[PDB]
Structure 1
Amino acid sequence: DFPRSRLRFKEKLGEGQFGEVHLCEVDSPQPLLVAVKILRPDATKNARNDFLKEVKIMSRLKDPNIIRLLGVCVQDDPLCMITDYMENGDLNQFLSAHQLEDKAADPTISYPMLLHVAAQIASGMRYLATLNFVHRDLATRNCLVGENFTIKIADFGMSRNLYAGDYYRVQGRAVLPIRWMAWECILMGKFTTASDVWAFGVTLWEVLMLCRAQPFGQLTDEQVIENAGEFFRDQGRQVYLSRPPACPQGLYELMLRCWSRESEQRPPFSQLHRFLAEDALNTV
């Protein structure tokens, strides 16, 4: 374990339902930067329980493209959770700050780098699928960026003010990221690896949009939920995200497969990874 006194708190990186995250320095790792989650100052008994369960969940996750648990604070110390610090933060904010490189002639990013970003996400999801672990909230806002466009999948919950518009809230119900959700999730509220594939399709759409636009952004929440009904009724009235400017038709057809009505017809993450890492390179 690790002593809290050995951590040197530098800045606040975020705040959630049952904890808050700080950038810390460590001078005796056994000047190293890490991210540390601690209880909120109004921490309840309920929050502490959720914190302990989060540690158990994160102890499971061991993959280059999933955030990893480096340690926890000592038994006697106030609770903390330590992970790698991803120095470029939020993938949504990161991509937002770039535009697609102009081949003919302001930080930019190339189409092959967008493929590399998306492939890393697919590799992380491929790993989670081997654990039969369902993410339930895959989106660029839940991905983190490190050095050299390294991507790790995380999950920061559904309460951040910055992304409030990405969730549909009804009193007494689970909060729902409806614009990322497969039709069967919207109608029947249950999540699978196949619905993670659907969300990956939307996440891939985000990446190729350079996070410039909300999925179905000109449709209301009510219209997005009704669209799920049109998938169910299967009478050809359902609608899809449009092809991003940066997205070749061949890659768009991959995305459309992620949004297949039948869960079994959606590509597995192994197929998605292969396409993004290899096939798509002839579309450059």
Structure 2
Amino acid sequence: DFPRSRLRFKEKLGEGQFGEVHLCEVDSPQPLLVAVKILRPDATKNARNDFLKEVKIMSRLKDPNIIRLLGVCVQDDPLCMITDYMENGDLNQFLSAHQLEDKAADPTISYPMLLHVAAQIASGMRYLATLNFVHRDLATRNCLVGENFTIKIADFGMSRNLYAGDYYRVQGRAVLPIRWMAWECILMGKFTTASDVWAFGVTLWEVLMLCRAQPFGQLTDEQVIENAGEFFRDQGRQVYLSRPPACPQGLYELMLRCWSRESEQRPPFSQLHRFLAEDALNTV
């Protein structure tokens, strides 16, 4: 554990439904920067409950490419969660500020580095699958970036105003990231490792687009939901995300397998990782 007195709050990183995140300095660990989530000023009973469960969920997760809990605060202190500061923020903003390098002749990013980024996400999901842990909301907006393009999968929740358009809302219902969701998820509301594979396909599409466009960006929420119906009825009228310019055809055919109607035919994270780390290198 860790005493709240030993933290030096420095600035504000973001706001959540039941907490808020600050960049803090630690002088006497056991100039070290860390990210700390604490209760919001208007902390409710229900919010303290969700905060404590977040700590329990996060305490399961121990992998180089998954966010890790470095510690929590002593019991009689006001509640806190401490994790590594990821200095380049979320992956969506980060990739947005880069463009594909022009090998012929603003920071840039090469195709092999994009593969490297995608492969780390795949490895993190490989780990989650071994725990039978289902993420439920994989997307570039929920990945963090550290030094040297290191990537860690996290989960900000669905409340950030910046990504409001990524979630479909109906009064009294669960909030749904429908443009990342497998057809069975949209129709029946339930999430599996196989639907995480589907979301990974979309996330891989994002990375290869350098996050310059929303998935199915020219279609409405209602058209995206109706597309799930076309997967169900299986009469060849369903549509897919198109091949990104940075994406060679061999890699795109792997993306497409992530959107197979049958869950069993979607590739496991072990195979996705192997392709991204090895096979995709002869397509460079």
Kindly provide the CA deviation profile for residues 161-218 of structure 1, in whole angstroms up to 9, marking residues without a partner as x. Answer: 0000000000000000000000000000000000000000000000000000000000
Give the distance between the partners of 1:2 and 1:157, measured in 2 at CA: 25
Report the CA distance between 1:62 and its aligned residue. Answer: 0.1
Report the CA distance between 1:159 and its aligned residue. Answer: 0.8
Give the distance between the partners of 1:18 and 1:179, measured in 2 at CA: 25
Report the CA distance between 1:15 and its aligned residue. Answer: 0.6
Matched, 1:20 2:29: no
Report the CA distance between 1:133 and its aligned residue. Answer: 0.2
Report the CA distance between 1:77 and its aligned residue. Answer: 0.4
Kindly provide the CA deviation profile for residues 67-96 of structure 1, in whole angstroms up to 9, marking residues without a partner as x. Answer: 000000011100000000101011000000
Report the CA distance between 1:138 and its aligned residue. Answer: 0.1
Report the CA distance between 1:109 and its aligned residue. Answer: 0.2
Kindly provide the CA deviation profile for residues 224-244 of structure 1, in whole angstroms up to 9, marking residues without a partner as x. Answer: 000000000000000000000
TM-score normalised to the size of structure 2?
Answer: 1.00
Give the distance between the partners of 2:11 and 2:253, measured in 1 at CA: 43
Give the distance between the partners of 1:11 and 1:177, measured in 2 at CA: 29
Report the CA distance between 1:14 and its aligned residue. Answer: 0.6
Q: SS at 2:40's partner residue?
A: coil
Give the distance between the partners of 2:41 and 2:272, measured in 1 at CA: 42
Give the distance between the partners of 1:11 and 1:95, measured in 2 at CA: 23
Corresponding residue for residue 213 of structure 1 = 213
Corresponding residue for residue 94 of structure 1 = 94
Report the CA distance between 1:281 and its aligned residue. Answer: 0.3
Q: SS at 2:158's partner residue?
A: coil
Matched residue pairs, number? 284
Report the CA distance between 1:124 and its aligned residue. Answer: 0.2
Report the CA distance between 1:63 and its aligned residue. Answer: 0.1
Report the CA distance between 1:142 and its aligned residue. Answer: 0.1
Give the distance between the partners of 2:9 and 2:242, measured in 1 at CA: 44
Give the distance between the partners of 2:47 and 2:157, measured in 1 at CA: 14
Displacement over 2 Å in runs of 4+:
none
* Runs of at least 5 residues in structure 2 that lack an aligned partner in the other structure: none
Give the distance between the partners of 1:105 and 1:28, measured in 2 at CA: 48
Instruction: Report the aligned-residue RMSD.
Output: 0.3
Q: SS at 1:239's partner residue?
A: coil
Give the distance between the partners of 1:54 and 1:157, measured in 2 at CA: 11
Kindly provide the CA deviation profile for residues 98-140 of structure 1, in whole angstroms up to 9, marking residues without a partner as x. Answer: 0000010110000000000000000000000000000000000
Q: SS at 1:148's partner residue?
A: helix
Corresponding residue for residue 75 of structure 2 = 75
Kindly provide the CA deviation profile for residues 22-51 of structure 1, in whole angstroms up to 9, marking residues without a partner as x. Answer: 000000110000000000111100000000
Q: SS at 1:71's partner residue?
A: strand
Give the distance between the partners of 1:31 and 1:5, measured in 2 at CA: 16
Corresponding residue for residue 154 of structure 1 = 154
Report the CA distance between 1:148 and its aligned residue. Answer: 0.2
Give the distance between the partners of 1:257 and 1:14, measured in 2 at CA: 36
Give the distance between the partners of 1:174 and 1:87, measured in 2 at CA: 32
Q: SS at 2:156's partner residue?
A: coil
Q: SS at 1:25's partner residue?
A: strand
Q: SS at 2:281's partner residue?
A: helix
Give the distance between the partners of 1:79 and 1:120, measured in 2 at CA: 31
* Runs of at least 5 residues in structure 1 that lack an aligned partner in the other structure: none
Report the CA distance between 1:145 and its aligned residue. Answer: 0.2
Give the distance between the partners of 1:106 and 1:49, measured in 2 at CA: 44
Give the distance between the partners of 1:54 and 1:244, measured in 2 at CA: 35
Report the CA distance between 1:245 and its aligned residue. Answer: 0.4
Query: % of aligned pairs identical?
Result: 100
Give the distance between the partners of 1:29 and 1:197, measured in 2 at CA: 38
Report the CA distance between 1:57 and its aligned residue. Answer: 0.5
Q: SS at 1:120's partner residue?
A: helix
Q: SS at 2:24's partner residue?
A: strand
Give the distance between the partners of 2:212 and 2:155, measured in 1 at CA: 21
